[PDB]
Amino acid sequence: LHAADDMQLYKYIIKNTAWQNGKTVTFMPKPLFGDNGSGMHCHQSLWKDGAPLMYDETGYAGLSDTARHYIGGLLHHAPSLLAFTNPTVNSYKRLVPGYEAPINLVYSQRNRSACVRIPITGSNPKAKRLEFRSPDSSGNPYLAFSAMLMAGLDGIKNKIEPQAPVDKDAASIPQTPTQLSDVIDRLEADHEYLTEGGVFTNDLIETWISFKRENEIEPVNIRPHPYEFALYYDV
Amino acid sequence: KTPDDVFKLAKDEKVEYVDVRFCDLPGIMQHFTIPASAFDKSVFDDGLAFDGSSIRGFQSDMLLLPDPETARIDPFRAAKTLNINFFVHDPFTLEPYSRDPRNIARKAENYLISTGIADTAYFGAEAEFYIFDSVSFDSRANGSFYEVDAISGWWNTGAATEADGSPNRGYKVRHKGGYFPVAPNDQYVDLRDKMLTNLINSGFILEKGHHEVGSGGQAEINYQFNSLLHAADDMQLYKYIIKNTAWQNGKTVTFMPKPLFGDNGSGMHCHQSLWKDGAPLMYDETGYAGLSDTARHYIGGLLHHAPSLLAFTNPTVNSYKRLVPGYEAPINLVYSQRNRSACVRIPITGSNPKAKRLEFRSPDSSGNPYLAFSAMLMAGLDGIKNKIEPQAPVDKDAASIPQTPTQLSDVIDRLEADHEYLTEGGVFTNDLIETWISFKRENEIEPVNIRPHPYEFALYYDV
Amino acid sequence: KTPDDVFKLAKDEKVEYVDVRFCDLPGIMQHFTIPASAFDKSVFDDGLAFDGSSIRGFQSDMLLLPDPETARIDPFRAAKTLNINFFVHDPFTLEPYSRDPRNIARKAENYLISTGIADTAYFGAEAEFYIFDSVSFDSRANGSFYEVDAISGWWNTGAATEADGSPNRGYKVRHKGGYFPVAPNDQYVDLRDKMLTNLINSGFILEKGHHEVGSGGQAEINYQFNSLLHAADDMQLYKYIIKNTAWQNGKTVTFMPKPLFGDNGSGMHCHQSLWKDGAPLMYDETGYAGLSDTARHYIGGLLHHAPSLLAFTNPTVNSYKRLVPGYEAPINLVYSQRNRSACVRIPITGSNPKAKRLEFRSPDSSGNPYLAFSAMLMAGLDGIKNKIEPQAPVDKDAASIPQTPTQLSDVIDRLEADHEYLTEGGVFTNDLIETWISFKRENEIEPVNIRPHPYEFALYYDV
Amino acid sequence: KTPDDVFKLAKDEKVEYVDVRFCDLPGIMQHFTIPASAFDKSVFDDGLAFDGSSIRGFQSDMLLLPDPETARIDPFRAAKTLNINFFVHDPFTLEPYSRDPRNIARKAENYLISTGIADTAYFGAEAEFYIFDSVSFDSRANGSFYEVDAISGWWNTGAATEADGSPNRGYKVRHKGGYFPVAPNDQYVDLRDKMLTNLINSGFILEKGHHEVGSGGQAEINYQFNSLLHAADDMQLYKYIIKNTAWQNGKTVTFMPKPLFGDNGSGMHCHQSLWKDGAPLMYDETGYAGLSDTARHYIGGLLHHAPSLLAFTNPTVNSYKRLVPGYEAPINLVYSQRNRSACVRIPITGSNPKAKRLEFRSPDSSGNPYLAFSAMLMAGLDGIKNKIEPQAPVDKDAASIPQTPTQLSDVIDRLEADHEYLTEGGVFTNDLIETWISFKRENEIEPVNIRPHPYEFALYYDV
């Protein structure tokens, strides 16, 4: 909760420092074509009774059973999870099918192209964690962090096993969907994990799906893109 | 029309040049020019040699053979010129080149004959366009824009003076209740008439049921149908004449499906029928809407293959701004007689068997009529061969009725998954289909996809 | 054509002035004018005297003798004028001046005869050019620029209004799939036709295989080949007609190899063949690609001497912006039948022996066709005399294949190291070759070299 | 200087932030910032972790270790900041990363020791720069420009008013006979003094023989030499202080070799000497110009390896606009005592053994001093190990004397062919040299090569 509060305050302070100094800031995922997008890397760990739960010397990359299953949840639910972690049409201009894009549904230790990265922290158990790389700053950190935790928890409860990790840089590796409308469809089809313990309600999820369809997806869709004039004016 | 007819036309009209025209893959006509004195019998017999990376459009020698039916005097070129369309052949083998759209249309017609189902496929097209005064656009790292404009555009009622500094005289607003008001609301009468005149002078046949229509800056002139290949030739010539009549009169035309947001898109309604031994095949008093078994099965093919068929009939990203999920949009995969919202409509023609036909309403003018008409025929023919039964027709205006896909990328995926019907008889080749899929993915779908949309800034700049 | 033919043309056309033309070293035609009334037999017999620092281009008296085959009515000059090309002779000795490019082309033709190898060398050239609306540039102590522009240039899609304040009407963008679209995409149709018409009226022969082509602002009109000297005369006249047709219609043309960055360069494909006693020498059914021993050895010479040959066929710094190490560039020192990437291509002409020839693809229009065609013949002749065997031909599209050098300074070095083949029969003299090497080094290579390039500021200002 | 010294400086100066600096390959310093409160002993012992695609410059985790000798208060940053340079290490192995220029300089120093030839290599550099008021440039399809400007530039004597509309007050023209006139001809006195003051405040030592000099917009401030690595650190800090002193006073500085055509280029004269056990190794009364065997052999190495050495000392395309084949240019591969035109000069220092050294005059400021100094040492050390004998020195002012290559592409070729001396002791690795060769070819040489130069339009538009 307070991490999300911190994010809101971060954005507030960044935007207003700029504003007071005659500038203007955007957190939108992709304001510049042919230049770096803006992402939000999310580090996550679970703790119990003041002790870390993610570490195990014996597991791959120092990961416990609980950690691996959490990852299992993230990767399995990713297509729907992006409805909160990457909630805008503009998000999918960053998450693009042919680059360094964190769109590959695998976990890794070296591959700066996987959804989930395990930062190298050595043998210090406290530092062990997972970094979800896909998200951006375009939505709601309260909802995004919550949704991530719910995916992880569903992964633990159902002992979901993730695909084998990939440490080297074809059609074998699954992708995150490439459009908001697709991820909204996936959210509609698979939101059971979010309703566990009444954290998200069906009512809220349906509202979110409606809002994005009617206010965001469709209004962009019906409006001719300037580049369509370059392509097609003279057909 | 024969070679001798063409030479006679050349001599009578005192032609100075001959323009050698051939169609490229996306649907733009290409040309080079030769002196009339070099246009003789050896052009029809041996053909014209031309560099084959130039004929192919990518970076070997090709041979061009003229189609005498397509010969027309160019009404725009100062030097008296005869335009003729050609087919692309391999120089060694004389084989029709498999990626020349005109060959594909010819192959489609020959295939029809070879199945014994019919001997002629007739296509009639009604194509809309917009007349503008100006267009500009660009796409940069830090920004993007487009702007189309017209003196009489309804968005200009507030202008203090026109672009040339002359006064605003009004008569711009579109009213409820009537789409086709008389002058001065109609501000394009004389220009449209010039287009009409040029079409009639260029051999277009306008008779009963053919008209010139205008609504704001939008217009349409329809004309007599033709057999498949020559119907597509007619469409190319139509576009050529409309664009250049506008150009010569200080205007600029677009056939793009959706140039204006919140205004009518531009469609191409395609009428189709099959004929054998001078007799129609679509009629039967006893069938629904007067349709024979052959007609119903053709419809079956159209509706079944529609998701992939749109890759040719609606081949651009901009197409899907017209085919939009919540309007009057011809996106519903049903056939009907009253519903101006179904893919296939059966125009009401009474009991005259000759007039019976089907109108495919989804297409637009943004692609290649040679490929689009061919693709439509192939869908229909696969429908007949496999006796495909269409869903029950719908004559009344929920989740029950299937839709056409809503994005070019989706219809390209569907083409990839289901193009078997197009390869029958070698009309389309797997090679060509794969090329078409690549081209649309790399040059159209992806380049639009990676570029932020202006409205994304309205929605998201301040997230 | 005889002197009497020329006098008859002068009298029939009511010529008022005769333009005395001669070629300078780099390749620009020079002139002065005399009244027609002073153009008589004594011009052909004795010649015209003219100050010989003026004829030579540097700072003695020279004599000019007319070539009757080059006589043409000037279609641009208001006062009726006859243009004729001349040879430069020493007044005392009547010796052909060794630095007049026209003499060098004549010497090349006579040398051919004297070797007994053949009696006629035919050259066919296809030369591209760009049509622009404007050009400006300068080079100062603290800055430098150039800018070429055209209303219809693809970089101008975003212009609010045109340079004259008229509205932007679009149709500027180059599409994938087709290089030669019809109007209105083709925005130079009428102007190109005017160029074509002027060429035909000026005695150029356009028959089977000859065409007018346009792509954006780029164009080409090819025409019937000719014997070496007169083929080069034809090229000079071609450029003259293209440039001035443009000029009279408010445009400006350039034949420079590479005016546009990231767009097609302008090349000059050079077709060549040798003939003896009215019969072709290049054909043999049994040889690869129908090539005789004489043809293959000619190719051997072209490829062996290519690095030095480019000093005349690609004689400018700007040439090497077209001949660039990573493209479709005709820079690969091989011959081929399919590979549009080899220096020498053998056009496919079937079994007709007369049509067999070789196409040297590397050259551009930036220099001197008299010197370029001569230099090409000498390379081919040295190849025959020494029976030089070319590498195995390549019909498929690594470090194995040798390249043409990539800079003018390199090819000038190679010319300095290997010009023996040019001095055979005294066609080129050592004196001339040394002068050419000096000129290019001091006036072209070095002046470009010492001037910072604008992109160096992008790369390095902040180092 | 020790870690404790640095902490003491941080505390005394009330530093708010620490700037973590590391050098990229081409030679620009990179940084990120941490709060001062996180700058403690664990920074020196364990280092700082940072994303290793960010540290590497291409698209794994890297560790950064501070060099206490490089700590300096930033005089420009409003928040009180301490700048420190770092070495890049692999996190797992603690191995110095082989492509961090700072490590390379360190490896060079350690290698020297390990050969027993000497224990310390001293480098002194004199680097010139230009002060301008403005710069702009671009590179587009249809045109290209750059423009640098200064109110007092000699090309501006004719200006009716200055850029701000204030009157032209003259005193701009450069006169014959004196390069360093006093004010008001000298229009940068106060700005240069600010630069001088900032250097002194930043730990630069200026004593006997050190000065501030200005000529038009050009300037130089030299300062006490240092051991190799730290001399390169000093150079980076020098450039930093010059550029930002200018920036804070509304000006803009460039260290590019040749910003002005027909005005002095900007060079970096590099003084070098070897020392062992606190004693000089370069002196010998008996040798020519007071040079020991070790010195002469070092020179031998420099002159022998110069063609490849310039890949680091003169690493840009713009470098070769200064090193031009017909001037005072330090391009002659000889050593001398009087000839201000030789690569290596021996400054006259009399019989004081400590002062004896060699000045390499060819280099400029356009690259990476860490790599340049290292490469120079390696050439010298290869010269000593193989007792390379240099050509006879030249004290008088033809084709006898060898030149440095005249183009970056040539020196890159020479580096590719001869880089064995750089890999001795693993100072440079083959991997790094290949990367450097690729980088220069793909990002610098080729991009300049493919872009038409403005002067080509002057020369060739009308061919």
Ligand SMILES: Cn1c(N2CCOCC2)nc2c1c(=O)n(Cc1ccc(Cl)c(Cl)c1)c(=O)n2C
């Ligand atoms: C009226 N119409 C249109 N137009 C409808 C109005 O817009 C122009 C096309 N297209 C038609 C028809 C049309 O009537 N038919 C049927 C058809 C076919 C061949 C013959 Cl000989 C005859 Cl007499 C009739 C057709 O087969 N097609 C394709």
Ligand SMILES: Cn1c(N2CCOCC2)nc2c1c(=O)n(Cc1ccc(Cl)c(Cl)c1)c(=O)n2C
């Ligand atoms: C078609 N062509 C072209 N053109 C190719 C198309 O562009 C213009 C030049 N150049 C040719 C040829 C060409 O055919 N020949 C061979 C040649 C030579 C002499 C005679 Cl009498 C005859 Cl009938 C044929 C040649 O020797 N040359 C040089």
Ligand SMILES: Cn1c(N2CCOCC2)nc2c1c(=O)n(Cc1ccc(Cl)c(Cl)c1)c(=O)n2C
């Ligand atoms: C005067 N100078 C310059 N400057 C010349 C004027 O511009 C600044 C560099 N650079 C020098 C020298 C220079 O004197 N030396 C020799 C040297 C080396 C070490 C010691 Cl302890 C001493 Cl006392 C002298 C050197 O080794 N280098 C590198």
Ligand SMILES: [Cl-]
């Ligand atoms: Cl979407």
Ligand SMILES: [Cl-]
């Ligand atoms: Cl799409």
Ligand SMILES: [Cl-]
């Ligand atoms: Cl050069």
Ligand SMILES: [Cl-]
């Ligand atoms: Cl270079």
